[PDB]
Ligand binder design. Structure first.
Ligand SMILES: O=C(NCCCN(CCCCN(CCCNC(=O)c1cccc(=O)n1O)C(=O)c1cccc(=O)n1O)C(=O)c1cccc(=O)n1O)c1cccc(=O)n1O
Ligand SMILES: [Cm+3]
Length: 177
């Protein structure tokens, strides 16, 4: 029981796919250095904290994906499964039925060099509402102004204005494990 208004998801034709995606090289820990999306809102009062997301390639070529967040003074863990989709670097969420309200969930790796940075596009439909976000990943907690400007540029090309783009503040708790 609500109302809400969302910037429309871009057509998928506007979201590049990393050429020749290498699933093994993409494994390991990534820090979320940038976040943009139609439900992302810059909040001056209570700024969003950096978290990390860990990709583990399984025998069957799906990823176990684990995100580690610092919240309420504890380390919080969200584990889920990315199942290979229609082309290399594209995934759907495994076990979608087990998430109530969730009808679709798409992941597309837009670009990466595997050992420093990545951008990843996510689109999900939940309670019939269409959310999308772009994540900027670093292998470390810092990235250059140049890379962050590129991420802002790309986010805008998908219809997002600046106040729907945030750069989570680096922290030491939980995510350096
Ligand atoms: O709009 C999006 N994100 C920005 C707002 C995130 N948020 C605020 C943060 C909440 C805190 N958590 C969520 C951590 C726990 N998660 C979940 O138990 C979960 C279960 C099933 C599906 C799913 O998606 N989740 O998250 C993150 O910081 C976190 C970390 C890592 C990955 C991740 O996804 N999240 O959120 C929301 O409440 C929200 C609003 C609307 C849709 C939505 O999916 N979420 O999570 C979005 C668009 C498309 C796919 C997608 O996954 N997301 O999040
Ligand atoms: Cm989410």
């Amino acid at each position: 029981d609500s109302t809400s208004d969302l910037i429309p998801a871009p057509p998928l034709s506007k979201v590049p796919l990393q050429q020749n995606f290498q699933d093994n090289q993409f494994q390991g820990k990534w820090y979320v250095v940038g976040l943009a999306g139609n439900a992302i809102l810059r909040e001056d009062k209570d700024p969003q904290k950096m978290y990390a997301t860990i990709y583990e390639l399984k025998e069957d070529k799906s990823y176990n994906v684990t995100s580690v967040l610092f919240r309420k003074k504890k380390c919080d863990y969200w584990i889920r499964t990315f199942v290979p989709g229609s082309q290399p670097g594209e995934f759907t969420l495994g076990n979608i039925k087990s998430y109530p309200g969730l009808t679709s969930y798409l992941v597309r790796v837009v670009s990466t060099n595997y050992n420093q940075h990545a951008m990843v596009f996510f689109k999900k439909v939940s309670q019939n509402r269409e959310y999308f976000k772009i994540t900027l990943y670093g292998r470390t907690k810092e990235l250059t102004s140049e890379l962050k400007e590129n991420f802002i540029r790309f986010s805008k090309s998908l219809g997002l204005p600046e106040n729907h783009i945030v750069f989570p503040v680096p922290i030491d708790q939980c995510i350096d494990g």
